[PDB]
Amino acid sequence: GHMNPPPPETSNPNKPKRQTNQLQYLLRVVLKTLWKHQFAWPFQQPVDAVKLNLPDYYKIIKTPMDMGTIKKRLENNYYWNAQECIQDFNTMFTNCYIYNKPGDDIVLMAEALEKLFLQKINELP
Numbered sequence: 764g765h766m767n768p769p770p771p772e773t774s775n776p777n778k779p780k781r782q783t784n785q786l787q788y789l790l791r792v793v794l795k796t797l798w799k800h801q802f803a804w805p806f807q808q809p810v811d812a813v814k815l816n817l818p819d820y821y822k823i824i825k826t827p828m829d830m831g832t833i834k835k836r837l838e839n840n841y842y843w844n845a846q847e848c849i850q851d852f853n854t855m856f857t858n859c860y861i862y863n864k865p866g867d868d869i870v871l872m873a874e875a876l877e878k879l880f881l882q883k884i885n886e887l888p
């Protein structure tokens with residue numbers, strides 16, 4: 764009846780690459796801190812709508828994003844500007860709030876990670 768879309772692209776080999784203080788901070792400080800949070804595990808890979816039986820997930824969410832994709836993107840120097848990476852983290856949180864309702868365990872988890880994300884991102888060098 765329903766299948767998953769392909770996961771987001773994690774490499775852009777025809778684009779030029781660079782290291783900046785903000786991109787290193789996004790990988791080694793922001794992503795590293797969120798990845799090891801007690802409630803990070805549902806956000807470390809794309810939503811498997813097939814395994815989780817969510818046939819409406821990819822009908823409601825057209826810009827899926829997850830930390831596993833952000834991690835691979837940062838490791839492949841996918842981002843040239845730190846604001847592109849920040850936008851992917853914000854898309855991941857906004858998708859969770861769009862699909863789910865307050866009081867849902869996944870939302871409580873998302874709100875805790877979002878608080879930690881905002882604390883580290885507000886200190887962006």
Ligand SMILES: Cc1nnn(C)c1-c1cnc2c3cc(F)c(C(C)(C)O)cc3n([C@H](c3ccccc3)C3CCOCC3)c2c1
Pocket residue numbers: 805806809810811815817858859862863868869872
């Ligand atoms: C939905 C949704 N919307 N945004 N996100 C980011 C999600 C999301 C993403 N990944 C997982 C996920 C990955 C898993 F591997 C497992 C296993 C197979 C081990 O059970 C469960 C997983 N669930 C559960 C879940 C929530 C609602 C409906 C069905 C399943 C959560 C997990 C946390 O506790 C509460 C229930 C996810 C929800």
Ligand code: NA
Pocket residue numbers: 859860861862863864865
């Ligand atoms: Na909601």
